[PDB]
Each structure stands twice: as C-alpha cells, then as structure tokens.
C-alpha cells in the first residue's frame, strides 16, 4: 500500500512530496523545529492570503479574490503594499524558494507551512492539511483585510462576507495566543499579545479581558490600548471584541479550556483554508502533520490579579473560576 520513498505510510501518493518539504521547513525555515517568529509570521500570512475573498465583489461584477490561493506570494509585489502586509517580505521570500524548490503550489505551501509551524508550538491541535489547490492566482483586491483600528461592526461585516459568523471570528483569534507586534509600536518590538507567545493556550482570552492598566512603551502606537502589565501589548480590535455584546460571550467561554479552544480553532482554520476552493476537490494529507508536544499548564490569572480585575462582558454566563497565581505582576520579555 502507500509507502512513501522514505518508508512513512500515507493515504495517497500525492502526499509523499510533503514529507520532503516537511524536512526542509523544520530544518531551515523553522530553525530546528522552533516556535518563534517564523511561525508567527506564517500564521499572519495564512489569514491575509485566505481573507482576500469577497462574495460581495463577485456579486456586483468585480473579481472578489481567489481566497487561499497563495496570491500573497505570487503577486507579492501588489499585495505587500497593502497597509496590513507590512513586515512580511522576508518571510514571503523564504516561502517562494521552498515552493519553487519542491514544485508545490503556493496556496498549498502556505497551508502546509501553517500546520507544521503549529506542530512546534506546545498546546496546538493537529490542523487538517489538504493538497490540490491550483498554483494560478490573480492579485487580491485591496481592502479585504481587517485592520486593528476597525470597529467590531466593520470586522464582523468583512469576516461575515468571507463566510464567518461572529463566533468563528472569536475562534480564529486563538492565533493571537502565539503572537506579537513589530509595526504597531516599534519602540516595543516583539511585545507579546499574551504572556505565553510560545504556548497555544487560553491566556490570550483571559488577559485581553483584564483592566487596561499599563502603558507598555514610551508612547502609544497605532491602535494601541493600555495593557494589564509591563511588556504586553494590547491592540484595540482585540480589546473591543472581548467586550462587545455580539462577541463577548464566546470570548468568555474560550478562557477556561485549552481543549475546547483548540477544537474550535481547528474547525475555523479548516474552513478558512479552503476559501475559494471546493474541499471535495482536494486530497487529504493530514497524516503528514506531526503531533505537537502537549501543554500541561492550566489557565491562570497572572501575577496576583483576581476576577475583580477582569471586566466581565458576557451578561448571561458567570465567569469561569480560574486559578490565580500568588505573584507580583509579570513583565514580559519580547517574544523570540
Ligand atoms: C480580527 C482580525 C484581526 C486583526 C485586526 C489582526 C491584527 C493584527 C495585527 C495588527 C498584528 C500585529 C502585526 C505587527 O505589527 O507585527 C497581528 C499579529 C498577529 N496576528 Fe492578527 N489580527 C486578526 C486576526 C488574526 C487571525 C485570524 C490570525 C490567524 C489565524 C492572526 C494571527 C496573528 C499572529 C500569529 C500575529 C503575530 C505575528 C508576529 O508576532 O509576528 N491574526 N494581528
Ligand atoms: C507557481 O507559479 C509561480 C508563478 O506565479 C511560479 O513561480 C516562478 O517560478 C520561476 C521558476 O519556475 C521563478 O523564476 C519565478 O521567479 C517564480 N515567480 C514568482 C512570482 O515567484 C512557480 O514556479 C509555480 N510553481 C509551480 C509548481 O507551478
Ligand atoms: Ca489570496
Ligand atoms: Ca499563548
């Protein structure tokens, strides 16, 4: 049955080249299978590539975008001029070379590089991986990427038009658990968005809900809000979404269980990976993706803060009783 040249077993002969690009990415792009800045940049790239898709434009005669077609790489020259795509150039070039070297389509390569990057981060689910997207793309229309200064209504309209309900917008945001910013406030380069930028866990949902207390750098940056402690950056769209009535209750159910957040994230990401394609036209190669080490820490309210410091926004569900740490307030180092 399907034994790939190097003896691994797989569902289908189209999955065998993906064991080679797996080794190239882990050794080179991920520097020895690490969960550091390349993983974070790839997670931003899969969303900015997949979200250039608009049924609204199609419906009014315009090209609405091919979705998760690898257009951000193939037409990087037009797409990396978009406001939202700053700081992605060096990662787009690294990906272009791996894709030209193994003969895989750019849309498939981005989805693959996302599932492999997440396997290096403790706590991550095994994301579905499908191969078969055509390498031909057209440039994404501008203005389809949500910005950090947008209102929650604007973000829900855009995501909604792409096909996501408010609940799936909160689920998709589990990726800000492995995250930092470099261009919203350059004085505090790589400031994490939660206290564990290398662990895919619930902390992001807990910490954006705490009262904004600290200005982390010398001045405020683009769409920056006050954060709960030294070194953490809080962006305006994440603060608004945690608190708005349309999304506040789903953001609250995401704080207590890494298992529920993970399943929810995996399901939204699987949907987002096929925007612009018919998943029944693709071949399933999920089994090429390895397991992530498990995360054994339980959700906590960091540094001595208590439930009295989180701004409860869901008016029907009471807050989960989460553990507290007997700590002095943390100060976060920049994410690696
Ligand atoms: C509600 C929409 C969202 C907005 C407005 C948004 C906005 C941003 C912004 C402005 C940054 C900081 C970029 C920088 O200056 O370096 C950021 C970082 C990041 N975002 Fe989002 N984001 C959203 C949704 C998502 C989604 C759905 C994913 C992916 C599944 C994602 C993954 C990331 C990651 C991993 C980073 C960290 C990158 C790094 O550390 O270099 N974001 N996001
Ligand atoms: C996918 O399409 C892109 C073109 O859009 C191809 O990329 C080019 O590949 C050649 C050599 O094959 C390079 O010299 C070019 O610089 C690449 N162009 C871009 C824009 O990156 C790529 O080869 C295609 N891949 C496959 C397997 O069809
Ligand atoms: Ca695209
Ligand atoms: Ca985290």
Coordinates of C-alpha atoms and ligand atoms in Angstrom, one line a residue:
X1 CA 0.0 0.0 0.0
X2 CA 1.4 3.6 0.1
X3 CA 4.7 3.6 1.4
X4 CA 6.5 6.8 0.5
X5 CA 10.2 6.6 -0.7
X6 CA 11.4 7.2 2.8
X7 CA 9.1 4.4 4.4
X8 CA 6.4 6.6 6.0
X9 CA 2.9 5.4 5.3
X10 CA 0.3 7.6 3.8
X11 CA -3.1 7.8 2.4
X12 CA -2.3 8.7 -1.1
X13 CA 0.7 9.1 -3.5
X14 CA 0.2 12.9 -3.6
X15 CA 1.2 13.2 0.0
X16 CA 4.7 11.9 -0.4
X17 CA 6.5 15.1 -1.6
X18 CA 5.1 16.8 1.6
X19 CA 7.4 14.6 3.7
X20 CA 10.3 16.4 1.9
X21 CA 9.0 19.9 2.2
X22 CA 8.3 18.9 5.9
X23 CA 12.1 18.3 6.4
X24 CA 13.2 21.4 4.6
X25 CA 10.9 23.7 6.6
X26 CA 11.7 22.2 10.0
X27 CA 15.5 22.3 9.4
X28 CA 15.7 25.6 7.6
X29 CA 12.6 27.9 7.9
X30 CA 11.9 26.9 11.5
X31 CA 15.5 26.7 12.6
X32 CA 15.3 23.2 14.1
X33 CA 11.6 22.9 14.6
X34 CA 11.2 26.0 16.8
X35 CA 8.1 28.0 17.7
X36 CA 9.5 31.5 17.2
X37 CA 9.0 34.5 14.8
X38 CA 8.7 32.4 11.5
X39 CA 5.6 30.5 12.9
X40 CA 4.0 33.8 14.0
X41 CA 4.7 35.5 10.6
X42 CA 3.2 32.4 8.7
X43 CA 0.0 32.5 10.9
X44 CA -0.4 36.2 9.8
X45 CA 0.3 35.2 6.2
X46 CA -2.3 32.4 6.0
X47 CA -5.1 34.8 7.2
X48 CA -4.0 37.6 4.8
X49 CA -3.8 35.2 2.0
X50 CA -7.1 33.4 2.7
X51 CA -9.2 36.5 3.6
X52 CA -8.7 38.2 0.2
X53 CA -12.0 36.6 -0.9
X54 CA -15.3 38.6 -1.2
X55 CA -18.6 37.2 -2.3
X56 CA -19.9 40.9 -2.2
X57 CA -17.5 42.0 -5.0
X58 CA -18.2 38.9 -7.1
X59 CA -21.9 39.6 -6.7
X60 CA -21.5 43.1 -8.1
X61 CA -19.5 42.1 -11.1
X62 CA -15.9 42.6 -9.7
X63 CA -13.1 40.0 -9.2
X64 CA -13.7 39.2 -5.5
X65 CA -10.4 37.3 -4.8
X66 CA -9.4 33.7 -5.1
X67 CA -9.2 33.0 -1.3
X68 CA -6.5 30.7 -0.1
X69 CA -4.7 30.6 -3.4
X70 CA -1.2 31.7 -2.5
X71 CA -1.7 35.0 -4.2
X72 CA 0.2 36.9 -1.4
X73 CA 3.4 35.2 -2.7
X74 CA 2.6 35.1 -6.4
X75 CA 1.6 38.8 -6.5
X76 CA 3.6 39.9 -3.5
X77 CA 4.5 43.0 -5.5
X78 CA 0.9 44.2 -5.4
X79 CA -0.3 42.6 -2.1
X80 CA 2.6 43.5 0.2
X81 CA 1.9 47.2 -0.5
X82 CA -1.4 46.8 1.4
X83 CA -1.5 48.5 4.8
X84 CA -2.0 45.2 6.5
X85 CA 1.0 43.4 5.0
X86 CA 3.9 45.2 6.4
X87 CA 6.8 43.2 7.8
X88 CA 6.1 40.1 5.7
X89 CA 8.5 40.4 2.9
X90 CA 11.4 38.4 4.3
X91 CA 9.0 35.5 5.2
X92 CA 7.3 35.6 1.7
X93 CA 10.7 35.2 0.0
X94 CA 11.7 32.3 2.1
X95 CA 8.4 30.6 1.2
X96 CA 8.7 31.3 -2.5
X97 CA 12.0 29.5 -2.6
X98 CA 10.7 26.4 -0.8
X99 CA 7.7 26.2 -3.2
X100 CA 9.8 26.8 -6.3
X101 CA 12.2 24.1 -5.0
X102 CA 9.7 21.3 -4.3
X103 CA 7.3 22.1 -7.1
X104 CA 4.3 22.6 -4.8
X105 CA 1.6 25.3 -5.4
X106 CA 2.0 28.4 -3.3
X107 CA -1.6 28.1 -1.7
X108 CA -0.8 24.5 -0.6
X109 CA 2.6 25.6 0.7
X110 CA 1.1 28.3 3.0
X111 CA -1.5 25.9 4.5
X112 CA 1.2 23.3 5.0
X113 CA 3.7 25.7 6.5
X114 CA 0.9 26.7 8.9
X115 CA 0.1 23.1 10.2
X116 CA 3.9 22.3 10.5
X117 CA 4.7 25.7 12.4
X118 CA 1.9 25.0 14.8
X119 CA 3.2 21.4 15.5
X120 CA 6.3 23.2 17.0
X121 CA 4.2 25.2 19.5
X122 CA 3.1 23.3 22.7
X123 CA -0.6 23.0 23.1
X124 CA -1.5 23.1 19.4
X125 CA -4.1 20.9 17.7
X126 CA -3.2 18.9 14.6
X127 CA -4.6 21.1 11.8
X128 CA -6.2 19.4 8.8
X129 CA -3.9 19.5 5.6
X130 CA -5.4 19.2 2.1
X131 CA -3.3 19.3 -1.1
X132 CA -4.6 20.1 -4.6
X133 CA -5.1 24.0 -4.8
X134 CA -4.2 25.4 -8.2
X135 CA -0.9 27.4 -8.4
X136 CA -2.6 30.0 -10.7
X137 CA -3.9 33.1 -8.9
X138 CA -5.0 36.7 -9.5
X139 CA -4.0 39.6 -7.2
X140 CA -6.3 40.0 -4.2
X141 CA -8.5 43.2 -4.4
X142 CA -7.3 45.8 -1.8
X143 CA -9.2 46.5 1.5
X144 CA -10.4 43.0 2.3
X145 CA -8.0 42.5 5.4
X146 CA -9.5 43.7 8.8
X147 CA -7.3 46.4 10.5
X148 CA -6.6 46.9 14.2
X149 CA -8.2 50.2 14.3
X150 CA -11.5 48.9 12.7
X151 CA -14.7 48.9 14.8
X152 CA -16.2 45.5 15.7
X153 CA -19.1 46.1 13.2
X154 CA -16.5 46.6 10.4
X155 CA -14.6 43.4 11.3
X156 CA -17.8 41.3 11.6
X157 CA -19.1 42.6 8.2
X158 CA -15.8 41.7 6.5
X159 CA -15.4 38.4 8.1
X160 CA -19.1 37.7 7.6
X161 CA -18.8 38.4 4.0
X162 CA -15.9 36.0 3.8
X163 CA -18.1 33.4 5.4
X164 CA -17.5 33.6 9.1
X165 CA -20.1 34.1 11.8
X166 CA -19.1 36.3 14.9
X167 CA -18.4 33.1 16.9
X168 CA -15.9 31.8 14.3
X169 CA -14.2 35.3 14.3
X170 CA -13.6 34.8 18.0
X171 CA -12.4 31.2 17.4
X172 CA -10.0 32.3 14.6
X173 CA -8.5 34.8 17.0
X174 CA -7.0 31.9 19.1
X175 CA -3.9 32.6 16.9
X176 CA -3.2 35.8 18.8
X177 CA -2.1 33.3 21.6
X178 CA 1.1 32.8 19.6
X179 CA 1.7 36.5 18.9
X180 CA 3.5 39.8 19.0
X181 CA 3.5 43.1 17.0
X182 CA 6.5 44.7 15.4
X183 CA 5.0 47.7 13.5
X184 CA 2.2 49.0 15.7
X185 CA 4.7 50.4 18.2
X186 CA 8.3 49.9 17.1
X187 CA 9.6 51.1 20.5
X188 CA 8.5 47.8 22.0
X189 CA 9.5 45.4 19.2
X190 CA 8.0 41.9 19.6
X191 CA 5.9 42.7 22.7
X192 CA 3.7 39.5 23.2
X193 CA -0.1 39.8 23.0
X194 CA -0.4 37.3 25.9
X195 CA 2.1 36.1 28.5
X196 CA 2.9 32.8 26.7
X197 CA 3.7 33.7 23.0
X198 CA 5.2 30.2 22.6
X199 CA 2.3 28.2 24.1
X200 CA -1.0 27.8 22.3
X201 CA -3.3 28.2 25.3
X202 CA -6.2 30.2 26.6
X203 CA -4.1 33.1 28.2
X204 CA -4.9 35.5 25.4
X205 CA -8.6 35.4 26.1
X206 CA -8.0 35.8 29.8
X207 CA -5.5 38.7 29.5
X208 CA -7.3 40.9 27.0
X209 CA -10.3 40.9 29.4
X210 CA -8.3 42.4 32.3
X211 CA -8.5 46.0 33.1
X212 CA -6.1 48.1 31.0
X213 CA -3.7 49.5 33.5
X214 CA -0.2 49.9 32.0
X215 CA 1.3 51.8 29.1
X216 CA 4.0 49.4 28.0
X217 CA 6.3 51.7 25.9
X218 CA 7.3 55.4 25.8
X219 CA 4.3 56.5 23.8
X220 CA 1.2 54.7 22.3
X221 CA 1.4 53.2 18.9
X222 CA -1.1 52.6 16.1
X223 CA -4.3 51.2 17.6
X224 CA -2.7 50.5 20.9
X225 CA -4.7 50.3 24.2
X226 CA -3.4 50.2 27.8
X227 CA -2.4 46.6 28.8
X228 CA -2.6 44.6 32.1
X229 CA 1.2 44.5 32.8
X230 CA 4.7 45.5 31.6
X231 CA 5.7 44.2 28.2
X232 CA 2.3 43.0 27.0
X233 CA 0.8 44.9 24.1
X234 CA -3.0 45.3 23.8
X235 CA -4.4 46.2 20.3
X236 CA -7.8 48.0 20.1
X237 CA -9.6 45.4 17.9
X238 CA -8.9 42.6 20.4
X239 CA -9.9 44.8 23.3
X240 CA -13.2 45.8 21.7
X241 CA -14.1 42.2 20.6
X242 CA -13.6 40.8 24.0
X243 CA -16.1 43.4 25.4
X244 CA -18.7 43.9 22.7
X245 CA -22.1 42.3 23.2
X246 CA -22.0 40.4 19.9
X247 CA -18.7 38.5 20.8
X248 CA -18.2 38.8 24.5
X249 CA -19.8 35.5 25.5
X250 CA -17.9 33.3 23.0
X251 CA -14.6 35.1 24.1
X252 CA -15.6 34.3 27.7
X253 CA -16.2 30.6 27.0
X254 CA -12.7 30.5 25.4
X255 CA -10.9 31.3 28.7
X256 CA -11.2 28.0 30.7
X257 CA -10.3 25.2 28.4
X258 CA -7.5 24.7 26.1
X259 CA -9.3 21.6 24.8
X260 CA -12.4 23.5 23.7
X261 CA -10.5 26.4 22.3
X262 CA -8.3 24.0 20.3
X263 CA -11.2 22.2 18.7
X264 CA -12.9 25.4 17.8
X265 CA -9.7 26.9 16.4
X266 CA -9.1 23.7 14.3
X267 CA -12.6 23.8 12.8
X268 CA -12.5 27.5 11.9
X269 CA -9.0 27.2 10.3
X270 CA -10.1 24.1 8.3
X271 CA -12.9 26.3 6.8
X272 CA -10.6 29.2 6.2
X273 CA -8.0 27.0 4.3
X274 CA -10.5 26.2 1.5
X275 CA -12.0 29.7 0.9
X276 CA -12.0 29.9 -2.9
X277 CA -11.9 26.0 -3.4
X278 CA -14.2 23.1 -3.0
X279 CA -12.8 20.8 -0.3
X280 CA -14.1 17.7 -2.1
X281 CA -11.8 18.5 -5.0
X282 CA -8.7 18.4 -2.7
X283 CA -6.7 15.3 -1.4
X284 CA -6.4 14.8 2.3
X285 CA -2.9 14.6 3.6
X286 CA -3.5 15.4 7.3
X287 CA -1.5 12.5 8.4
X288 CA 1.8 14.1 7.2
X289 CA 1.5 16.6 10.0
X290 CA 3.1 15.6 13.3
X291 CA 1.9 15.9 16.9
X292 CA 2.7 19.0 19.0
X293 CA 4.0 18.4 22.5
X294 CA 1.2 18.7 25.0
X295 CA 0.7 21.7 27.2
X296 CA 0.2 20.7 30.8
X297 CA -0.3 24.1 32.5
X298 CA -3.8 25.1 33.5
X299 CA -5.3 28.5 32.7
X300 CA -4.5 31.2 35.3
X301 CA -5.0 34.8 36.2
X302 CA -1.4 36.1 36.2
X303 CA 0.5 37.9 38.9
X304 CA -1.8 38.3 41.9
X305 CA -4.7 39.8 39.9
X306 CA -8.1 38.2 40.6
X307 CA -11.5 38.0 39.0
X308 CA -12.1 41.6 40.2
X309 CA -9.6 42.8 37.6
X310 CA -11.3 41.2 34.6
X311 CA -14.0 43.3 33.0
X312 CA -16.9 40.7 32.8
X313 CA -18.6 41.4 29.5
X314 CA -20.9 38.4 29.0
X315 CA -24.1 39.3 30.9
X316 CA -25.8 35.9 30.9
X317 CA -22.9 33.4 31.8
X318 CA -20.9 34.0 35.1
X319 CA -17.1 34.0 34.7
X320 CA -15.3 30.6 35.0
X321 CA -13.5 30.2 38.4
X322 CA -9.9 30.2 37.0
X323 CA -6.8 29.7 39.1
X324 CA -4.8 32.8 40.4
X325 CA -1.0 33.0 40.8
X326 CA 0.5 34.3 44.1
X327 CA 2.7 36.5 42.1
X328 CA 3.9 40.1 41.8
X329 CA 2.7 41.4 38.5
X330 CA 4.6 39.9 35.4
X331 CA 6.7 41.9 33.0
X332 CA 7.0 40.1 29.6
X333 CA 10.2 39.7 27.6
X334 CA 9.8 40.2 23.8
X335 CA 8.6 37.1 22.0
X336 CA 11.6 35.1 20.4
Ligands
LIG1 C1 -10.0 40.2 13.9 C2 -8.9 40.4 13.0 C3 -7.5 40.5 13.3 C4 -6.9 41.7 13.3 C5 -7.4 43.1 13.2 C6 -5.4 41.4 13.5 C7 -4.4 42.3 13.5 C8 -3.1 42.0 13.8 C9 -2.0 43.0 14.0 C10 -2.2 44.5 13.7 C11 -0.9 42.3 14.4 C12 0.5 42.8 14.7 C13 1.3 42.9 13.4 C14 2.6 43.6 13.6 O1 2.7 44.8 13.7 O2 3.7 43.0 13.7 C15 -1.3 40.9 14.4 C16 -0.4 39.9 14.7 C17 -0.7 38.6 14.6 N1 -1.9 38.1 14.2 FE1 -3.6 39.0 13.9 N2 -5.3 40.0 13.6 C18 -6.5 39.5 13.5 C19 -6.8 38.1 13.2 C20 -5.8 37.1 13.2 C21 -6.1 35.8 12.7 C22 -7.5 35.3 12.3 C23 -4.9 35.2 12.7 C24 -4.5 33.9 12.1 C25 -5.2 32.7 12.2 C26 -3.9 36.1 13.2 C27 -2.6 35.8 13.6 C28 -1.7 36.7 14.0 C29 -0.4 36.4 14.5 C30 0.2 35.0 14.7 C31 0.2 37.5 14.8 C32 1.6 37.7 15.4 C33 2.7 37.9 14.4 C34 4.1 38.2 14.9 O3 4.3 38.1 16.1 O4 5.0 38.5 14.2 N3 -4.5 37.3 13.4 N4 -2.6 40.7 14.1
LIG2 C1 3.6 28.7 -9.4 O1 3.5 29.9 -10.1 C2 4.6 30.8 -9.9 C3 4.4 32.0 -10.9 O2 3.3 32.7 -10.5 C4 5.9 30.2 -10.3 O3 7.0 31.0 -9.7 C5 8.0 31.3 -10.6 O4 8.9 30.2 -10.8 C6 10.1 30.5 -11.6 C7 10.8 29.3 -11.9 O5 9.9 28.2 -12.0 C8 10.9 31.6 -10.9 O6 12.0 32.0 -11.7 C9 10.0 32.8 -10.7 O7 10.7 33.9 -10.0 C10 8.7 32.5 -9.9 N1 7.8 33.6 -10.0 C11 7.2 34.1 -8.8 C12 6.2 35.2 -9.0 O8 7.6 33.6 -7.8 C13 6.1 28.8 -9.7 O9 7.1 28.1 -10.4 C14 4.8 28.0 -9.9 N2 5.0 26.6 -9.4 C15 4.6 25.5 -10.0 C16 5.0 24.2 -9.3 O10 3.8 25.5 -10.9
LIG3 CA1 -5.1 35.2 -1.6
LIG4 CA1 -0.2 31.9 24.5

